[PDB]
Design an enzyme around this catalytic site. Sequence first.
Site, PDB file in Angstrom:
ATOM      1  NE  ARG A   1      -3.183   2.444   3.062  1.00  0.00           N
ATOM      2  CZ  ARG A   1      -2.820   3.354   3.965  1.00  0.00           C
ATOM      3  NH1 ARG A   1      -1.711   3.210   4.684  1.00  0.00           N
ATOM      4  NH2 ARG A   1      -3.579   4.413   4.156  1.00  0.00           N
TER       5      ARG A   1
ATOM      6  NE  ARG B   1      -5.412  18.968   6.913  1.00  0.00           N
ATOM      7  CZ  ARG B   1      -4.114  18.715   7.081  1.00  0.00           C
ATOM      8  NH1 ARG B   1      -3.208  19.661   6.842  1.00  0.00           N
ATOM      9  NH2 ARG B   1      -3.721  17.511   7.488  1.00  0.00           N
TER      10      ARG B   1
ATOM     11  CE  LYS C   1      -8.360   4.698   3.793  1.00  0.00           C
ATOM     12  NZ  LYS C   1      -7.249   5.696   3.759  1.00  0.00           N
TER      13      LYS C   1
ATOM     14  CB  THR D   1      -6.444   2.331  11.364  1.00  0.00           C
ATOM     15  OG1 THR D   1      -7.698   2.109  12.028  1.00  0.00           O
ATOM     16  CG2 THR D   1      -6.696   2.900   9.930  1.00  0.00           C
TER      17      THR D   1
HETATM   18  O1  LIG Z   1       8.468  10.329   6.017  1.00  0.00           O
HETATM   19  S1  LIG Z   1       7.242  10.405   6.848  1.00  0.00           S
HETATM   20  O2  LIG Z   1       7.560   9.991   8.240  1.00  0.00           O
HETATM   21  O3  LIG Z   1       6.695  11.783   6.854  1.00  0.00           O
HETATM   22  C1  LIG Z   1       6.130   9.425   6.254  1.00  0.00           C
HETATM   23  C2  LIG Z   1       6.104   9.078   4.892  1.00  0.00           C
HETATM   24  C3  LIG Z   1       5.132   8.219   4.376  1.00  0.00           C
HETATM   25  C4  LIG Z   1       4.186   7.716   5.263  1.00  0.00           C
HETATM   26  S2  LIG Z   1       2.933   6.676   4.875  1.00  0.00           S
HETATM   27  C5  LIG Z   1       2.437   6.708   6.549  1.00  0.00           C
HETATM   28  S3  LIG Z   1       1.162   5.898   7.190  1.00  0.00           S
HETATM   29  O4  LIG Z   1       1.699   4.823   8.053  1.00  0.00           O
HETATM   30  O5  LIG Z   1       0.368   6.853   7.993  1.00  0.00           O
HETATM   31  O6  LIG Z   1       0.309   5.326   6.125  1.00  0.00           O
HETATM   32  N1  LIG Z   1       3.183   7.469   7.381  1.00  0.00           N
HETATM   33  C6  LIG Z   1       4.201   8.079   6.711  1.00  0.00           C
HETATM   34  C7  LIG Z   1       5.189   8.934   7.154  1.00  0.00           C
END
Ligand SMILES: O=S(=O)(O)c1ccc2sc(S(=O)(=O)O)nc2c1
Lengths: 492, 396, 396, 492
Positions: free
Chosen positions: A49, A90, A238, A296
């Site tokens: 994903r 937002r 979703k 989640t």
């Molecule tokens: O590089 S970051 O830490 O900003 C970053 C980059 C891509 C995703 S995808 C998700 S998710 O688990 O919420 O789907 N969290 C992050 C965090």
Amino acid sequence: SQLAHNLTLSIFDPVANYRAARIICTIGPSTQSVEALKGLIQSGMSVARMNFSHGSHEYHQTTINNVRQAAAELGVNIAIALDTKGPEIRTGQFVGGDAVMERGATCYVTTDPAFADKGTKDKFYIDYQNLSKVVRPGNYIYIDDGILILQVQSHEDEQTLECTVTNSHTISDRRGVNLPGCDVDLPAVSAKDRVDLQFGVEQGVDMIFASFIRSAEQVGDVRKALGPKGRDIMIICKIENHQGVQNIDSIIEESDGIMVARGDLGVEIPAEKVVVAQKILISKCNVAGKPVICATQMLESMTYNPRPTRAEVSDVANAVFNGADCVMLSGETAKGKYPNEVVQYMARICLEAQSALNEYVFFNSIKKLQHIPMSADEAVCSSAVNSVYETKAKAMVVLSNTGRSARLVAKYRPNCPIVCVTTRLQTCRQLNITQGVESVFFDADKLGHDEGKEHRVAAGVEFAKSKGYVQTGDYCVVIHADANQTRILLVE
Amino acid sequence: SQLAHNLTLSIFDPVANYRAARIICTIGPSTQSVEALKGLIQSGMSVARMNFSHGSHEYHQTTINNVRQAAAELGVNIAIALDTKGPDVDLPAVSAKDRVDLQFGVEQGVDMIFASFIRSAEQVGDVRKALGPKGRDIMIICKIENHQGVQNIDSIIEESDGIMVARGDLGVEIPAEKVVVAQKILISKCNVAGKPVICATQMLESMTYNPRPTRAEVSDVANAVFNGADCVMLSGETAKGKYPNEVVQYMARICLEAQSALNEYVFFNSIKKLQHIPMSADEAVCSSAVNSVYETKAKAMVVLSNTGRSARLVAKYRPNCPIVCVTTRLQTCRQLNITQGVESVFFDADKLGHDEGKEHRVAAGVEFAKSKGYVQTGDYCVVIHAANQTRILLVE
Amino acid sequence: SQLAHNLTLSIFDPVANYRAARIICTIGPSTQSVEALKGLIQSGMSVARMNFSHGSHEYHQTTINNVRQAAAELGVNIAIALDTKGPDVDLPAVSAKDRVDLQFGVEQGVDMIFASFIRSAEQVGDVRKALGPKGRDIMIICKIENHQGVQNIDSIIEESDGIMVARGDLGVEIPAEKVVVAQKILISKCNVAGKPVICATQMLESMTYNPRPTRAEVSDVANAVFNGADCVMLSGETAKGKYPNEVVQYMARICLEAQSALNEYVFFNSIKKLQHIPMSADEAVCSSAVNSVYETKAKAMVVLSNTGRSARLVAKYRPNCPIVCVTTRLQTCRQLNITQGVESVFFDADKLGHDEGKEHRVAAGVEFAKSKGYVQTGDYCVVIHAANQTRILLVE
Amino acid sequence: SQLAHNLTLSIFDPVANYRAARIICTIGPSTQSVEALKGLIQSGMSVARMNFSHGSHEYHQTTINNVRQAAAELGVNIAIALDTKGPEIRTGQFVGGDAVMERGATCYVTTDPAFADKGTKDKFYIDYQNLSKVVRPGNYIYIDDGILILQVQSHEDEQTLECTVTNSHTISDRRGVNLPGCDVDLPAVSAKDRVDLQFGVEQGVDMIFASFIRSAEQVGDVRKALGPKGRDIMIICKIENHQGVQNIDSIIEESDGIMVARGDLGVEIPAEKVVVAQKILISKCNVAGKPVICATQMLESMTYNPRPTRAEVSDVANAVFNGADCVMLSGETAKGKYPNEVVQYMARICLEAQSALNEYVFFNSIKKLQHIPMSADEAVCSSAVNSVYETKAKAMVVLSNTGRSARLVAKYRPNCPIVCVTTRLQTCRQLNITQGVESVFFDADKLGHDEGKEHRVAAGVEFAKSKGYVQTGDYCVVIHADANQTRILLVE
Ligand SMILES: O=S(=O)(O)c1ccc2sc(S(=O)(=O)O)nc2c1
Ligand SMILES: O=S(=O)(O)c1ccc2sc(S(=O)(=O)O)nc2c1
Ligand SMILES: O=S(=O)(O)c1ccc2sc(S(=O)(=O)O)nc2c1
Ligand SMILES: O=S(=O)(O)c1ccc2sc(S(=O)(=O)O)nc2c1
């Protein structure tokens, strides 16, 4: 009779030699490299994903390539899923990036665009034009993941709402907002999504995880956004709010599957009702014969801890008992510390729960709900699975070009592996979200059109032999549906 | 058919008019006073648990007295339970302290024992011995804490009055995913045996110091109810917690919500299909009494029981309406607090006669159901005195 | 559920488009000529019976030749059966004459034996021995005529290819009311075993010299069909009777009427509930094939069978539609004439190829059903070749 | 599962110690004496039928007295049934008492009263005024028990029908006539019946066997003819033609029971359809919870022969298997040579068939047809019988003043005797047409009103002890319905 089945269980007896549940991993920093995606596959990832909430097309193009190369190196087929950002409500900006909201204080929320940058504790912007037209006095507004609760007192004008602050919480720039008792009429896809989707088609993604679905009409909007070249891509809806829940029947009819987003639903609905909502949605999907993802807050603590809590473990097990096709990992694999360990443990929990699960109750429950007369296809698939129970067969072979009959068989829940033999690669990938099914590609171009079906069947049975599900002497149930056919094969 | 029942559900419908599952609270520093205990009762406590791993006989004596005062001031009946400190290995069943403690419990008139670390069937006879002849009416609930309890579960259930699944204790040796499954096993074996079962430890733990629990903790409690647990138990959350009332009230809310989703008929039918033919009379009367609830859509049952036996027998078959038990022994009221779906009414014989024609008792049961909004004029109500008798009464 | 099915019936509705039960006629003075036999066939005869208690081998040879001529002139297939003369007592199984007669039957190529006075299981092996290796494909139907046959019914059925209930013979020792009940027993045991059963003697006897039978005789035949008999048998009524054609035509009419009233699903379900799990493949395929008739409301089955085995296996499960058996052996056509609910189509391999992909055979079956008005475009039709295969075909 | 039950049967095993089926005997020359009625009771008569087709009130008054005195001498209660003559369609008179009708010849039937005495082979009288208005061209007329068949060609006028004679048969004075495809609208009761019924009330008969019932409205006519003092007398409807069969549902609703008159139906309907009609009617009655009598041509040959035919025997057995409460004897006891032997043999056949009958299929079949929610009374009775099966109880005790709850219990068909304890004598008699039930009178006048119910229960259990159905240790299911109650009693 799940009860009865429980009576005969022994936790020391060996677990099944097969895992029916499928695992979806979100890819990010911790796992975007080909060598990490490789360790993820081996741990049990079936679906990759990409969260288009973050990252540019550039970042995801890498995920795509890294996935396709990891898969092809291991000889396997792995699904690529695009999870959209979706419409967002937002706030605007605050003076000094901040506004200290104190309990008891009065404030004004406005859709007046002039207030976009100059928000204060007293009057600030929320970017959803229909806010006033959809909220009424008494309703609540959640700001910042449900933490700040404002209660609506009255309309200051047609653009501005007078609000009591019901609890203290400081809020900063651009916080998300939720309307728990309100029918939000934002469009189905945001302008960005439309671009991201268009990208998805172009890059040949397998399934859209479609955000914030609230009605069936909106599934059409998503479909129409995938345009004429996107007609074979699965739309997985979703469910994130009360609307999604209320309209679930019509939404399931139009879509290709469902994701239960527990955390999102949780912002607006009490946790104990979300538990129950999970039950309803999984069961409706099981009856509809469409994949359902439990998503989640699955093994969240294991993002930074070596082992998860007891309660998170039962959470995963009970999604399997509820009837989930899939369990999904988010942060735990996107940016966690133990990305392999978490996938491995998830696989182990699923495997354990499946050994406790009486599949026969599912088969029975679903068969009992069929209208008589049945259509041929419904009859062939259910009797095929009945034949498994009656002859104690130990594998099934399903010949299906589009996956359709494989999903029809899987819906009836046989107590043994289902081997789908297909002539489409996208089919082998798309079935990665269907419990109990394994695919095999059959190259009709090179190996011939097999109009007899003997080769695909042979390919099926051999596949089940290498995996050790069947040996010489066991039974195996074969099915070609759409013209149709069923055989109970003695394995040589 | 739980599956089919799920299909018809709406989370936006109103919840059921009654909660079936029962809440046990561990008493301690946060909750030992008469007032705090009153808060606990009003919040949903049915059973006060004393952990005899801590505190003197004087401490626990204070628990007992305050519980009695709090309950009598509120006009309800609360059960008191003694949880013993206790000892592939085998130490003796009860320790010397346990034996002393159990004797104390009898003098004080506790309602039930939570026997720690039970590993086999004769170990129950030991607890029974240590209680002596003066404690013969006291329920023994066996705490299953390791693989031996699991292995010898059948014979342990046969001898005990009930079981407690101690998930946390079990989790030290057994991987978590297997405890989940063992929970399913033990609960179902007890449902079938017809004896109370408690799901315990690690319930809503984060709520000991946080104002709200985790979502996972919430589904844990709900899934315990779905598994078939009679009872759910709070330990540190109420003994030393910061939010004792809030945790209980929440546990109650989770249980009520789960129960609206639960199909009781799946239980009734599954347990019925297991009865050997011929059934004895008590069994047949109770199963078919519950059967009549379903066939006539009765809105309440009224059970006349002196020792609570036929009350637990009816409750085993899981009707989809409240069960009102009318009884001449206040101890039965307290003891029925570990049995799901039952509420008790004390009938004082010494103050109202022996009522050996049963009319007055029956009438108090129906009046109770009327007052709780369960039945009104024109509803059906199933009455059972088990010698035995079923009656389908039209409520006037 | 026969009860519930009775509720929905109307005697003023039209009868079913097919008769399932099969008529056996004894040949004799009234009926031995080619023409008379043609009358019998058209009236509803499926099986010609020669009573070897009378007449020489020359007489019976004449029966065989005329039957063959009558059938071939009409383009149908008629079974020929030899009913042996035969011997708490025990004489040998076959007599010397029987042994001579049976050998003659083999040379002539008869389809089945009606073995008189069978009392035990090895007695069947004897009949089998006397037929020698050249008569291995000949069906042995055991005539149950006394208490020993009844007592040893289970093992006798195991060894035989079928049973005949000889009510009249049984009635000499056993009171009439008990023969009725023994009829129920034997028919049901055979239905379960999956082997043909014939209800015989005293059928429509008064119609040997009267133009119409008694009302009681009429319910006798109908109740034989309701009991579950594959076949009903005429003796004197056709051999020496005055109204041979009328009696057959009437028997057919009674059977058709009874069948409109009969709930086949009661049979299917009762027999299914008896199968031990796991089933073998042949069993599972056939039961679930019939199951599919019911679930999809298919209007005909098509069974590919060479020896008739899987045809009798399907017929055992009593679908509520005609079964068309397509076969490469004309003997199978004749032999299937003692199996209820089945009609045969000869597929000539030597004239049309081996059709090992089955398409042509299947097509001849469906064409037959179309021609008999059983299925039209848009009806479903269940096809089974049992190696095995079910197919649910939409008819075009 | 009748099938399954058949598998376990052995014809040498002992028959049941109880006969559920009840036997109705027609009284005449052979059996009108007190000493013959006595031998009839001992042979197994429960109901005495008087055929008001023959005899004067004087003759039947003797039957009544002889019955009441036979019963009272033996200490038993025996039902008295009045079978009406009913409306008849008959011919008039012929010149020389005779008219030789030859096949092919033409004749004229007329409703013209002038032709009442002067009938010829050419034109004669039939006494049903509406004949022309109800017959149409193509229809048939049966004269003389269906033997002579005339086909209707046309209307000569509005009073006269032109007919082809379809078969040769000589016919004499006043022959009966039947109209197989015609809706006959004769009134429900004849002028004579009205007098005979009035007599029946006066003399306190238990049940009317009401002739030629064709619609529900006609049951009302019979009821209204029994007048205000006849309201507790049971009306049992004789079904004799296609109309009765077509209107059976509404007829069963209005009446208190049904007689299947096979011979009468046989005049107009092919025998094989009558067999099936018997099935339908018995089953409808079983579901309605109302007694059903299987009547005519039962053991007919035994009117003058010592033993009956095989086929007559299966006829009787199969009426029991169909579900008949009762089997009836006509000529066999009215004017036969072996009146005791026939009753005895009938009892033996019933007893044999009952041992082969799986009652549990009946209970199941009837319970499966109940609407949920059930009414209290339906629920109590069915669960009471379920309790019998589940605990293997060996008798039932039913407290019922009007018989109503006893019939409600009997409908569910327990596999053990039902003992009805009642405070009405007419109730003990009226239950003589209900299978599986035995009655006991409880004198509430002399022994007290027993408002506790302990005495009637005790009277019940003792009655079952003397008969040897229960002994100390067995179970017994007790029921008071209408307020209600059920007990599973351990016998002391
Ligand atoms: O590089 S970051 O830490 O900003 C970053 C980059 C891509 C995703 S995808 C998700 S998710 O688990 O919420 O789907 N969290 C992050 C965090
Ligand atoms: O006084 S203390 O705070 O030490 C104290 C006293 C009693 C109990 S009972 C429990 S438990 O149910 O959580 O095990 N914890 C404590 C702690
Ligand atoms: O030539 S005869 O009239 O003697 C004759 C010839 C053959 C048979 S077969 C039967 S039977 O099926 O009724 O037993 N009866 C007869 C009578
Ligand atoms: O004295 S008579 O022989 O005329 C006579 C008298 C009364 C009855 S009652 C019946 S019945 O069996 O048809 O009901 N037949 C007769 C015959």
